[PDB]
Structure formats: C-alpha cells, structure tokens
Design a protein around this ligand. Structure first.
Ligand SMILES: CC(C)(COP(=O)(O)OP(=O)(O)OC[C@H]1O[C@@H](n2cnc3c(N)ncnc32)[C@H](O)[C@@H]1OP(=O)(O)O)[C@@H](O)C(=O)NCCC(=O)NCCS
Ligand SMILES: CC(C)(COP(=O)(O)OP(=O)(O)OC[C@H]1O[C@@H](n2cnc3c(N)ncnc32)[C@H](O)[C@@H]1OP(=O)(O)O)[C@@H](O)C(=O)NCCC(=O)NCCS
Ligand SMILES: CC(=O)N[C@@H]1[C@@H](O)[C@H](O)[C@@H](COP(=O)(O)O)O[C@@H]1O
Ligand SMILES: CC(=O)N[C@@H]1[C@@H](O)[C@H](O)[C@@H](COP(=O)(O)O)O[C@@H]1O
Lengths: 164, 164
C-alpha cells in the first residue's frame, strides 16, 4: 500500500543514482522501516505510534490532490533514508489552478552529501510541473537558498508564522 | 451550497460588525456576487468561468480537511467584498498534527480601511487554533509584517518560489 500511485511518480525519478536506493512513495509498512526516527531528525514527531501512523497514512492516501510523500529506501538496511513531500492546494486564482508546496525534506544524518536530497528535489519539481501547478514553493533558512536555487527556486517575500 | 459548514465558523465570527456585512463561508452562488472580480484584485484569475468555478467549488466543498474560505458580503450591494482562506495540511510530524495556512486575503479596493481584513484574520486565527493546528503561517511583502503581527504572526525564515 503506497500513499499515492507509484505510476504518477515514475516519470520524474532521475536516471542516475546507484542501486541500492529505491525512490518510491511512502508505504504503509515504512513505520517498520524507521520512518518516524527519520522524521525525528527533522523536527518533533510528538506521540505518533504505529496505529496513529496508519490512520493518518490512510487519510492522506485517500486525499485528492494526493499527498506526494516520496521516500528513498536503502535496500541494504531495509531503512527509509530520505523523505520529501509535495502537497498541492486547489485554488480559484489562475484559472482554478493549483499551488505546490515542498515540505518535510529530511535526509538521514548518516547519508548526507550523497545527492539523496537533490534527487528528491529534482523529482518533486518535475512532478509538480507535470501536475500542472502554477507555482511551487518552500520555506528554509537563508543558508539553504543556494541549495534550493539549484532546482529553480528563488527567494521571494516574507514568511510569517505562529505556533499553538 | 456553502464550501464548509457555517457552524464550524460561528464561534470565530466577531460580535459588533456593521449591519450590512455578513461573514460566512464562500457559497456556490458567490460567482454571481462578484467573487471573480474580487479575486482579480489579488492576482490573475486566468480563464475562471462559472463552470470552472462551480466544478472547483465542489472539489473543495467535499475535501477533508475543508477549505475554510471565509468571505464577507455587503448585503447592501449583494457583492462579496472580502475573502480569506484557511487551508490545512495533514502531517505525520507533531503527533500526526496539522498545519494551517492563510491564503488569498483580498479586500475590495473601495472597501479597504474598514477593518474587513482584520475581521477575517481574527476569525481565521481563532478558527485555526480551534481546529488544533500546531502552526499557522502566511506569506506577505515586508510592508505587511506589522499588519499580520496584530494577529499573532511573527517574521520567520525565507520563502522560495518557482513559477511554471
Ligand atoms: C539540506 C539537505 C536537504 C541536502 O541534502 P543532501 O542529500 O545532503 O545534499 P547533497 O549532498 O545531495 O547536495 C546536493 C548538491 O547540493 C550542493 N549543496 C549541498 N548543500 C548546499 C548548500 N547548503 N548550499 C549550496 N549548495 C549545496 C552540493 O554541492 C551538491 O551538488 P553537486 O553534486 O553539484 O556538488 C540535507 O543535507 C540536510 O541536512 N537536510 C536537513 C537540514 C540541514 O541540515 N540543513 C543545513 C543547515 S544550513
Ligand atoms: C492589508 C489588508 C489585507 C486588510 O485590511 P483592511 O480591511 O483594509 O484593514 P484596515 O486598514 O482597516 O486595518 C485594520 C487594523 O490593522 C491596522 N493596520 C493596517 N495596516 C497596518 C500596518 N501596515 N501596520 C500595523 N497596523 C496596520 C489598522 O491600523 C487597523 O488597526 P486598529 O483597528 O487597532 O486601528 C487590505 O488593506 C488589503 O488587502 N490591501 C491590499 C494589499 C496591500 O496593501 N499590500 C501591501 C502593499 S505595500
Ligand atoms: C522545505 C522544508 O523541508 N521545510 C520544512 C517544513 O516542511 C517542516 O514542516 C518544518 C518543520 O519544522 P517545525 O516543526 O518547527 O514547524 O521545517 C521546515 O520549514
Ligand atoms: C496572505 C496572502 O494573501 N498571501 C497571498 C497568497 O495566498 C496568494 O496566493 C498570492 C497571489 O500571488 P501569485 O498569483 O503571484 O502567486 O499572493 C499572496 O502571496
């Protein structure tokens, strides 16, 4: 069970990259392949157990637009070592267009500088373009502007937040 | 008919608003109350005609999480004069939490400086708190930082975009 149809993803996955990496949608059994621990490296996972994972996974799976949560399993360890998400918001502006957002980009602490992050970003950009979104966006610290610039992004206006 | 359940919105609507003004969900017949012209003051509406508007309305009305597109009608002109959207993304982070985003804030040019924008932002923040979101965010030109800081927002990291 994949969180979105792998056939949607197949055209956008870059050609290079070694085996033993599989780029694919998030699978329901990725909880048992270390997905929470990977997400912990990005921010707090709070109280997410398998059961809450599975319920959320199903809620996302049956969403349209899909949650395009794309992961990289390293076949050796049977672990998920990178994740990045493209989520899409429907709009009335731009001819009832849609806006893409890249979220929750994480590459496992032991597996950086192996182009895992670049592969995910290239894949999501290609996917978003193909899905027809008029604009794709993301949020990062200024030190990552040159990272994401590589994939066609450029610094835009202010981003404001508040937490509860 | 309403894009989401008005009883969801009721607790968040401020008391004491001039009698001519009704805060409520976007309604399918708002196309005939100038909603496209209102949106055009924000940005391009592209080829949005009634059929496209209705078809998109229905896709949004049936979405869970809902699209909380809140508008204010001037019932003395029977036109929608202001709109703002709270949209919600499901997450696995933060105990399968959710993120709220404030989008497409527009107040008719002739109806500015009458607090409509503050009403809508006050309402959406209150709504988003009550929905349980862990973080609400928005994007704006720097000139609007002190505007949106009134509703609890703070300048955060960078926001990067790519248009297709
Ligand atoms: C940021 C992150 C997503 C990048 O993922 P990665 O898989 O380690 O990145 P890569 O090693 O694939 O880097 C890919 C390309 O980006 C370039 N690059 C990497 N980081 C860069 C950066 N921060 N700024 C500019 N270019 C960068 C590299 O030169 C490489 O290109 P190349 O193959 O042409 O030389 C990941 O490392 C990461 O750490 N994520 C968590 C957040 C974090 O630590 N951010 C850094 C704090 S500033
Ligand atoms: C900004 C906007 C969304 C909403 O507001 P509006 O209904 O016109 O709101 P008002 O001007 O009536 O302001 C409401 C409150 O916020 C305050 N406010 C407005 N702008 C402010 C600012 N820039 N900084 C601090 N407070 C501000 C007002 O003083 C008022 O406070 P009060 O009731 O305690 O006195 C609306 O004016 C708009 O869409 N404008 C077009 C976009 C725009 O101006 N972009 C910036 C280009 S530089
Ligand atoms: C491009 C990218 O990966 N951006 C992420 C965002 O998607 C994630 O939700 C947040 C988690 O941090 P938080 O727990 O403080 O909100 O960090 C970054 O802004
Ligand atoms: C808080 C707010 O209203 N932000 C809006 C955003 O929601 C809207 O989608 C975009 C339209 O501009 P665009 O057509 O250039 O993307 O403008 C602003 O960033």
């Amino acid at each position: 069970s994949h969180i979105f149809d792998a056939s949607v993803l197949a055209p956008h996955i870059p050609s290079n990259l070694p085996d033993n990496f599989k780029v694919r949608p998030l699978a329901k059994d990725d909880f048992s392949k270390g997905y929470v621990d990977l997400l912990s490296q990005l921010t707090s996972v709070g109280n997410l157990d398998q059961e809450a994972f599975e319920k959320r996974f199903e809620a996302m799976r049956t969403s349209v637009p899909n949650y395009h949560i794309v992961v990289i399993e390293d076949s050796n360890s049977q672990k998920v070592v990178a994740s990045a998400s493209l989520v899409v918001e429907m709009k009335f502006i731009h001819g009832a267009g849609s806006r893409g957002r890249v979220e929750d980009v994480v590459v496992d602490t032991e597996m950086r500088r192996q182009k895992l992050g670049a592969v995910l970003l290239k894949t999501l950009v290609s996917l978003g373009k193909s899905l027809g979104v008029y604009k794709i966006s993301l949020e990062c610290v200024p030190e990552l502007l040159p990272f994401y610039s590589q994939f066609g992004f450029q610094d835009d206006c202010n981003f404001m937040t508040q937490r509860f």
